[PDB]
């Protein structure tokens, strides 16, 4: 060994700027000798809803359904639906998880929100006492690669949309950090669509360039102060 | 006369704490003589995924699928999927929209994130320009009614999960304010699974009692400072 990378990718269109950034991630990490896996959520028609279908066979209480409880129990009893256990297997084996998505409403698209809701269950991603620093996925790196509609000016502390780190908190701290990940600095590709075919190629290339030294990188301190303070 | 209310409700179990909060809201608004509609997302089997199935007419650009561009043009042409347009009709008629959901990863369950992704499209909820204070849904009130797993103390600036207002940002500001809603103070029912019987009953009745005077409330100043202080 050797390192393993999972790219969780959430875009409808392979020719898109998200497609290109995913293809460049695959090419470059593959070049370096890395083991690479991609979850293309839309091509998988990945199920985003948290429902009782997520548990196979019979339920620990079919009278009052409690998703958190029943999925925890199904995880321990190897009874989670196979789309979920497949995703968990890829996360278990990965040293680095990259999420590649367009910003939808200051967050992840719903299909990707559902991956997080469904795959990162109690028992697998976290437990009492295994959370934040002690989360079950400790030692793994996570990285957000996000494209925006709005320009970098719009995302400053006194722009319309506030500081980028404001929306990153629920994903980076609330989700990734809670599960044990060390979170690398986000990669935000601002406003690809109102940009020349040449600021674009430079955005794709700095992503490609950045992946070259990805393993030497230091994890951000994932704190309230990092996201909000000075 | 004569207010209209929409409750967008995202929970699997009618007998849950969310279910109760939703029932008391129906009962209380109904008692006041308000017109009440409930979108029960899980029971509608609501589609969270933003796909090309959401447009039924000729695509603007059939070679490269762009979801934001296609749904904007489908909106103006009236070729959006009818599940989207049924929701837009409920929103259009409403004076107040209440979101009732359990916090999933510092945000909304994916089914409800899909509601926001698919229903609040360009042309309907905002335009460029015509957002934030100029958003197209100006005039309407919005309220988040959220239940948590973590306690109020968790949930504080010096607690593990940070201040509760940190995770409201993408939802209150990035989504609702952007579309032009005035945002009412969120209702957060902290840690109902941990609470005693009387503490739960008191939480239900606090919601009930708040709704009695709901139309006399001023919105919050929905800004970086309200969310983040400092
Ligand atoms: C429901 C919804 C909610 C949204 N919410 C927000 C929000 O909160 N905040 C916000 O800022 N935005 C938001 N947006 C806008 C969204 O984030 C952007 O539309 C998106 O990030 C653009 O990424 P893309 O890959 O789809 O762009 P694309 O349109 O696919 O890419 C831009 C251009 O680059 C070209 N291209 C493809 N590959 C390459 C490459 N090899 N090199 C050079 N050019 C290439 C493409 O052909 C295209 O012309 C939202 C959009 C939707 C639909
Ligand atoms: C995928 C996922 C992600 C999550 N992420 C987070 C997170 O990021 N942060 C966080 O804090 N939490 C998180 N949670 C926890 C979640 O927010 C809570 O479990 C949820 O808010 C609890 O609400 P509920 O309606 O399901 O409670 P229930 O378990 O249904 O309610 C608790 C008790 O109240 C009882 N009850 C129902 N109605 C009444 C009434 N009329 N009067 C008195 N008692 C009543 C119920 O019968 C039950 O016994 C997550 C959970 C999941 C499954
Ligand atoms: C500049 O900051 C934003 C840009 C955009 C949106 C939201 C933003 O701040 C909350 C947004 C929602 C949205 C929804 C669609 O269906 C299509 C495009 C969208 N869009 C953007 O370009
Ligand atoms: C106290 O703060 C949290 C509580 C909980 C979660 C995340 C939290 O902080 C980010 C969370 C994720 C989660 C996922 C499941 O499948 C079932 C239960 C869950 N759970 C909680 O109780
Ligand atoms: Zn953190
Ligand atoms: Zn605001």
Swiss-Prot record, chains A, B:
Summary of activators and inhibitors of this protein: Inhibited by melatonin, resveratrol and 5-hydroxytryptamine.
Compartment list: Cytoplasm
GO cellular component: cytosol; extracellular exosome; nucleoplasm
One Gene Ontology molecular-function label: melatonin binding
Binding site for FAD: 11, 17-20, 103-106, 147-150, 155, 193, 200
Residues modified as Phosphoserine: 79, 196
Domain of life: Eukaryota
Transmembrane region(s): none
Keywords in alphabetical order: Cytoplasm, FAD, Flavoprotein, Metal-binding, Oxidoreductase, Phosphoprotein, Zinc
Enzyme class at the top of the EC tree: oxidoreductase
Entry protein name: Ribosyldihydronicotinamide dehydrogenase [quinone]
Organism, as annotated: Homo sapiens (Human)
């Amino acid at each position: 060994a050797g390192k393993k990378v999972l790219i969780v990718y959430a875009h409808q269109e392979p020719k898109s700027f998200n497609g290109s950034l995913k293809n460049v991630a695959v090419d470059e990490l593959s070049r370096q000798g890395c083991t690479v896996t991609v979850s293309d959520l839309y091509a998988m028609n990945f199920e985003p809803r948290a429902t009782d279908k997520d548990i196979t066979g019979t339920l620990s209480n079919p009278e009052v359904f409690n998703y958190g409880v029943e999925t925890h129990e199904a995880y321990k009893q190897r009874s989670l639906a196979s789309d979920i256990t497949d995703e968990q297997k890829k996360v278990r084996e990965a040293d680095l998880v990259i999420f590649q998505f367009p910003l939808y409403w200051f967050s992840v698209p719903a299909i990707l929100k559902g991956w997080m809701d469904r795959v990162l269950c109690q028992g697998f991603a976290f437990d009492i006492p295994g959370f934040y620093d002690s989360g079950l996925l400790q030692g793994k790196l996570a990285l957000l690669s996000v494209t925006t509609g709005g320009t970098a000016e719009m995302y400053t502390k006194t722009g319309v949309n506030g500081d980028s780190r404001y929306f990153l908190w629920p994903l980076q701290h609330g989700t990734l950090h809670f599960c044990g990940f060390k979170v690398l600095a986000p990669q935000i590709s601002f406003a690809p669509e109102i940009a020349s075919e040449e600021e674009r190629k430079g955005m794709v290339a700095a992503w490609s360039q950045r992946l070259q030294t990805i393993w030497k990188e230091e994890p951000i301190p994932c704190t309230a102060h990092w996201h909000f303070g000075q």
